Design an enzyme around this catalytic site. Structure first.
Site, PDB file in Angstrom:
ATOM      1  CD  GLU A   1      -4.675  -4.556  -1.340  1.00  0.00           C
ATOM      2  OE1 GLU A   1      -4.039  -5.313  -0.548  1.00  0.00           O
ATOM      3  OE2 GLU A   1      -5.275  -3.611  -1.285  1.00  0.00           O
TER       4      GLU A   1
ATOM      5  CB  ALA B   1      -9.110  -0.337 -12.145  1.00  0.00           C
TER       6      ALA B   1
END
EC number: 2.7.1.107
Lengths: 115, 104, 116
Positions: B54, B8
């Site tokens: 992140e 994803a």
């Protein structure tokens, strides 16, 4: 100094909560203590001891943050009646990366040491 | 869960693709140079951390987006906070590589 | 897109300023962090030691920032919904604690080998 004891209280509440509720976290705690024991028992330089311990603790940190995210998501889904595990997937991915980092760290370091 | 979220993040996030490239590159480069184990480990870890942070930031952004379609001060604050965390991981990574490679 | 980087950096600094203004723990831990970073750049140690001393302490910054983001999300939810267990906040507080402990351990192991 009261704010400090309050914050630390919150931290212990969280830690005990994670220990009781999350099995992977218990395994990670075991992993941390084992890491410290092994690192200190083996005749090993400072930077390497530090790295062997830190790499494993990082897993604990990321796991805790992930669990926090999961909790938020769960409150949402409880009041929202709609579910999408995008966030949970991302968090789990993060934890995975942390683990891989630890395995690489231990591989490289222990391979060097026993070379 | 894991590979689902990674796939994803790769498909959607551009900064994450750049960070993955950066990670593998960092691995190759760390393994190429004649440095000690601690150095190699730091060179890899510093870059992997950016990826981790992140990912977490992306999870936060996902949650924020799921909460409400409307923008709020706290929701915006949350995003900005996560973006700041990523920034620090990058600086750390930069500082890590600088201290190490200059010494080398 | 090269501009995307400067946009994301803008968001980042907006978040750093936000964290410094609103969060006190971020300010204090920031003081300890900057102090640590300064000290690490003046210590007569090897590159690995310096990187360790600095990064261990900057991790505290990162984790605190993430914890602050999560707290912001919970605070967002708390406006719409009435009850809050604050379990997520507790978990984040735990994470920050572990980060700090890690930093301290790092510094102790490193400096007791250095000075010792």
């Amino acid at each position: 100094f009261t704010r400090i004891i309050k914050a630390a209280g919150y931290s212990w509440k969280g830690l005990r909560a994670a220990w009781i509720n999350e099995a992977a976290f218990r395994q990670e705690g075991v992993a941390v203590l084992l890491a410290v024991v092994i690192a200190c028992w083996l005749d090993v330089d400072a930077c390497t001891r530090v790295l062997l311990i830190s790499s494993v603790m990082l897993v604990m940190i990321v796991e805790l943050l992930n669990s926090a995210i999961e909790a938020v998501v769960d409150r949402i889904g409880s009041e929202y009646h709609e579910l999408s595990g995008r966030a949970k997937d991302l968090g789990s991915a993060a934890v995975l990366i942390a683990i891989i980092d630890a395995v690489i760290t231990w591989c490289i370091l222990l391979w060097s040491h026993f070379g």
